[PDB]
Structure 1
Amino acid sequence: VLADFHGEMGGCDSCHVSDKGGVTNDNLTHENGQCVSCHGDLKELAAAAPVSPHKSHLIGEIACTSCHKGHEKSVAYCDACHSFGFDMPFGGKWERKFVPVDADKAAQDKAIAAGVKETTDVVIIGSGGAGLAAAVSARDAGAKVILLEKEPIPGGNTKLAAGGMNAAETKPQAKLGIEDKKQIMIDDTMKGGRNINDPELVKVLANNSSDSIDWLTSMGADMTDVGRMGGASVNRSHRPTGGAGVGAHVAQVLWDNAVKRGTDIRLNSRVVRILEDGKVTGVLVKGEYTGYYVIKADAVVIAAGGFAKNNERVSKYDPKLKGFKATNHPGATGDGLDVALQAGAATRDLQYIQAHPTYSPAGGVMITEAVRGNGAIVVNREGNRFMNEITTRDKASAAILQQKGESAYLVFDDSIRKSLKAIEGYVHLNIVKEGKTIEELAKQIDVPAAELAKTVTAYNGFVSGKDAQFERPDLPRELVVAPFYALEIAPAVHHTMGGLVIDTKAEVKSEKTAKPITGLYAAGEVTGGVHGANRLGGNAISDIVTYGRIAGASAAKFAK
């Protein structure tokens, strides 16, 4: 392992700040400074490469030490989701065992009384889009902030985002000739959420849309290419130009701005208990290398995101998903909720767990909803259609579940390819089957040529505005310019629509007292009610930004 290979050289000193050893802080700045001092930084390393582990889509600072582990085997962090078989010096397999947020209670108790280390105004749990947005906002005229993230690298699931941030009206929308209006936001959002959605939440989720999409814009963002997500009417999923992805893009831009203002962002730092006056007094942090510690603060924003990814827990409410795969990063296991619950928060819609119908087994990645939206059709093992490809996720997950072998085949054109640039990434991942003709495509895929061809020729007829098979309301492109591609895909646990109960100010309500627990804030996937029973594609990112901002600001006035 790497620190022995380097003990052989110069000592403990090489990396650590002292000759006895040990880490100063959990972001591991010193040591990573040491790394780069002898080896160069990531751009330097990246330039040297001929798929390289030193240059990727991850956002934010990506410590050397997030892969190159000192005192233990090392693993590319890319293996949490891909299987690149890189040949990592001092290699190891990626393994994560979920450990309870409450275990080691004695230890936590012993350490709560044992001093009082730092104090700040506002603490924010998690670094995805909601926590960063909150960072900007608390910081941005108001308070001192100290955001913790448990992962070794930032941006949660936010950074994987693919297809768009919903907003209504007055976003750039103007400039493309997309005619849309606020109530249509609300109204689809209720319809997709099967009408249980907290009405006041879906309201500000409608009415702050444009501003969050302008805020992003005041910060550096590129929200201009618009498309169609399953479930809405007027086109409104904002993204970067030509079909790239908004998650990385948004995460990055709010990472920068949060860092730019004075946020004190700390990785390998998991919050394991909110501190009880019953007012929120502070937080108990388990810094991975520096041990436990208390931070006193006046407001706590909870922005830890969802629990998709914990199959134990998700199987708990919907055992249909036991054994299913997830589209999330490793961090979404519910720590947040647990922390909050211990604090006596109220939750809702915990059992409504959204599976994404088009994940790819082979690639270990989601494959965006926009591929079907720009024109792809889905095809079972027999070579035929079985569904209106732009239906709701739950219906589309259901239908592929009910098909030969539990999986199905996205099938598109050279025309759909060109038109949605996320598709170059899939191509880059070796997961896309190619055919110079549909008969060629079939052979790769192991689906019958005359049936697939008849399917595709017929689909084309439907394309002529009428799907006399499955009702697909939009038929964007014809599927007739070669080469032709396909991917097999299947449903994967993806979003948890439920969560902590909060108002339009982002306050968290107590189960017992049905009022807010004081100075306890929340925003993002960790919260409940914004999406009802079903989340619309494109509503997560807009919920996260607009609610973060509110959570931040609310927490800032508190303490002020």
Structure 2
Amino acid sequence: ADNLAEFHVQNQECDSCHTPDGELSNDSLTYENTQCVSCHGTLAEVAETTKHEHYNAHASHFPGEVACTSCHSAHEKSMVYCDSCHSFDFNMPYAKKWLRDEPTIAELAKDKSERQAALASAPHDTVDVVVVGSGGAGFSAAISATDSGAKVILIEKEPVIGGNAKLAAGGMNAAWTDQQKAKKITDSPELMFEDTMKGGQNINDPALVKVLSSHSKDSVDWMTAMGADLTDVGMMGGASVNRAHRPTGGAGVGAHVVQVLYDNAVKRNIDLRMNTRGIEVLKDDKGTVKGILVKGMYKGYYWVKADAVILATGGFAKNNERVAKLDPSLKGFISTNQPGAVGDGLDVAENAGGALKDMQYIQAHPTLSVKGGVMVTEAVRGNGAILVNREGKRFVNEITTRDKASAAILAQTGKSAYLIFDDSVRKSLSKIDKYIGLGVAPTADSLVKLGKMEGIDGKALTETVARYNSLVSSGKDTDFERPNLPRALNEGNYYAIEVTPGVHHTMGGVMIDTKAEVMNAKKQVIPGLYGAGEVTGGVHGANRLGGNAISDIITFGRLAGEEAAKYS
């Protein structure tokens, strides 16, 4: 057969998959997916049948309950979502090459011509608040608004939840938390503010950063009350003390936080709609929002009547064309992001009259795995790893800010470097075992063998580590002034990961005030319109600190949800 449906109808009726009337249930394809599960079992049950030693299409790091139709279409060939960042050896029936070519908001003007008819119709739903995007900002806002008495609809344009937030590794910054105190760490919201302002070249909006620093503990407390583990607290670049919180053992913060938000959303019966793209904010005759029209992938255009809309759509770091127009030094770089992170929500915001700011400030993560084409967490460095070049030498303070680290690596021979660490560092951060399972962390019982394996001068490598270990014991890095020297690299075997910068985060975005209200170029608030998370600009200035984006999206997501509800 040429497609999955044709396969099944060889021995099945249409209503094995469909509703009696044959209409698709909704854009999440709830009923239909329910039918696949009825015959094949849950995604976990399918997973038992498709294991490989180091990977499994049906048991991944994605949180939430991933719908079968995310990858398995019925009446046409479909794409494996994992192929958007990896190239695993898969044999999905009826597969086609991964290719993402979502139309822009501007191109969707080719649907006047569908859109006019929708807007002429009754609104499909009438609620209080509509939140766009199921990343951390969006779930936080949806939950926050719901607890504040508002009826919400949460929409996600992708087939799966979580956006980039589900990918987060290194942690969530906050000061001065109960969790830090339990780990004997001394910190303050003032210190966090100062690290943050300096890290961003004092470009950041000080009122927004004040909100980030002062609400950070509350945000950790809120997530914890909802069931999250934020008890491990690590170091990230440009911070005066350890303040990046994540699950026990040093597991990734991202999938965990989104899973917790998802669970809490489902607990409150929040209306979550997948494959549903926010297209244009609707405003009444006095310019306040009155709703939003959306495009369901399976059921087409419709609008939702509401007093408020919260845009929580993430950044545009996956869109290299737009990035390179803003910062040509990043043209052609690989990105760390999910395939939908291309900035269409910003278009939505601008079309609704919101102004943008700081857009030229785009952050490259200094360590994308060259071999895997995926982000390798900064916590690897925070927990003690060093960087060496092909000459087997250190060349930079590995916990400096990302602008400086990226430039340093790009200035080394071959425009890449190697993370080097031992088993003590490996055991201190369980997320590192994920890089090993991905096959991107070759290992050996001596630095000479490792260097010969990876094309690093082996003798130089050895002396570099011996010398670095001596600075660790002396307590002072006189070579590159790295301010925190947490571990000597001397336990067990040695690992190398080849790394180079990848485009990661867009610090610019829609202009918001401290209540997360979106503003126009005259600095006037657009009543009913809110923005939270990486879609906004002004929080992180010219360079964002590792750990500060998850802090941002919880704090500003929650704040937007409560402001939205109050606005009502």
Question: TM-score category by the smaller chain?
Answer: over 0.9
Q: What is the CA-CA distance between 1:259 and the residue it aligns to?
A: 1.9
2:273 partner letter = R
Q: What's 2:537 paired with?
A: 528
SS in 1 for 2:259: helix
Q: What's 2:77 paired with?
A: 73
Check the 8 A contact 1:139/1:262 in 2, yes or no. Answer: no
- Which of 423, 439, 453 does residue 414 from structure 1 map onto? 423
- Which of 106, 115, 132 does residue 102 from structure 1 map onto? 106
The whole-number CA distance in structure 1 between the counterparts of 2:123 and 2:442 is: 58
SS in 2 for 1:13: helix
For these two proteins, the number of residue pairs brought into alignment is 557
- Which of 109, 115, 135 does residue 128 from structure 1 map onto? 135
1:160-199 counterparts in 2 under 5 A? 160-199=167-206
2:89 partner letter = G
Deviations 1:448-479 (A, max 9, x none): 11121122222222221222321111122111
The whole-number CA distance in structure 2 between the counterparts of 1:216 and 1:98 is: 33
TM-score by length of 1: 0.97
Q: What is the CA-CA distance between 1:222 and the residue it aligns to?
A: 0.4
1:518 partner letter = P
Q: What is the CA-CA distance between 1:47 and the residue it aligns to?
A: 3.4
- Which of 453, 456, 465 does residue 456 from structure 1 map onto? 465
- Which of 323, 334, 347 does residue 325 from structure 1 map onto? 334
The whole-number CA distance in structure 1 between the counterparts of 2:144 and 2:498 is: 42
TM-score by length of 2: 0.96
Deviations 1:128-179 (A, max 9, x none): 0000000111001221100110000001111100011010113322211111
Deviations 1:182-223 (A, max 9, x none): 110111111101112111111111111111111111100101
1:326-475 counterparts in 2 under 5 A? 326-463=335-472, 464-475=474-485
SS in 1 for 2:510: strand
- Which of 146, 152, 175 does residue 153 from structure 2 map onto? 146
2:489 partner letter = L
The whole-number CA distance in structure 1 between the counterparts of 2:275 and 2:369 is: 30
SS in 1 for 2:264: helix
- Structure 2 alignment gaps of length 5 or more: none
Q: What's 1:30 paired with?
A: 31
Task: Please tell me whether residue 16 in structure 1 is matched to residue 37 in structure 2.
Answer: no
Q: What's 1:509 paired with?
A: 519
Task: Please tell me whether residue 270 in structure 1 is matched to residue 277 in structure 2.
Answer: yes
Q: What is the CA-CA distance between 1:258 and the residue it aligns to?
A: 1.5
Check the 8 A contact 2:155/2:277 in 1, yes or no. Answer: yes
Check the 8 A contact 1:145/1:262 in 2, yes or no. Answer: no
Moved over 3 A (4+): 47-50
Would the alpha carbon gap of residues 503 and 171 (structure 1) be closer, same or farther in structure 2, given more than 3 Å must change?
farther
The whole-number CA distance in structure 1 between the counterparts of 2:178 and 2:300 is: 45
Q: What is the CA-CA distance between 1:109 and the residue it aligns to?
A: 3.1
Deviations 1:365-392 (A, max 9, x none): 1000011111111111222111111111
Deviations 1:307-328 (A, max 9, x none): 1000010011001111111111
The whole-number CA distance in structure 2 between the counterparts of 1:451 and 1:211 is: 47
Task: Please tell me whether residue 537 in structure 1 is matched to residue 546 in structure 2.
Answer: yes
Check the 8 A contact 1:433/1:486 in 2, yes or no. Answer: yes
Q: What is the CA-CA distance between 1:76 and the residue it aligns to?
A: 2.3
Structure 1 stretch displaced more, 60-69 or 7-16:
7-16
Check the 8 A contact 1:128/1:159 in 2, yes or no. Answer: yes
Check the 8 A contact 1:102/1:272 in 2, yes or no. Answer: no
The whole-number CA distance in structure 2 between the counterparts of 1:187 and 1:364 is: 33
Q: What is the CA-CA distance between 1:262 and the residue it aligns to?
A: 3.0
SS in 2 for 1:320: helix
Q: What's 1:52 paired with?
A: 56
Q: What is the CA-CA distance between 1:114 and the residue it aligns to?
A: 3.6
The whole-number CA distance in structure 1 between the counterparts of 2:123 and 2:530 is: 22
Task: Please tell me whether residue 249 in structure 1 is matched to residue 256 in structure 2.
Answer: yes
SS in 2 for 1:517: strand
The whole-number CA distance in structure 2 between the counterparts of 1:474 and 1:174 is: 19
Q: What's 1:4 paired with?
A: 6
Q: What is the CA-CA distance between 1:7 and the residue it aligns to?
A: 2.2
1:287 partner letter = G
The whole-number CA distance in structure 2 between the counterparts of 1:360 and 1:72 is: 34
Structure 1 stretch displaced more, 310-319 or 465-474:
465-474
The whole-number CA distance in structure 2 between the counterparts of 1:257 and 1:493 is: 32
Q: What is the CA-CA distance between 1:413 and the residue it aligns to?
A: 0.8
- Which of 161, 164, 168 does residue 157 from structure 1 map onto? 164
Q: Provide the alpha-carbon RMSD of the alignment.
A: 1.3
- Structure 1 alignment gaps of length 5 or more: none
2:83 partner letter = D
Q: What is the CA-CA distance between 1:415 and the residue it aligns to?
A: 1.4
The whole-number CA distance in structure 1 between the counterparts of 2:282 and 2:89 is: 43
The whole-number CA distance in structure 2 between the counterparts of 1:163 and 1:171 is: 19
- Which of 455, 468, 479 does residue 489 from structure 2 map onto? 479
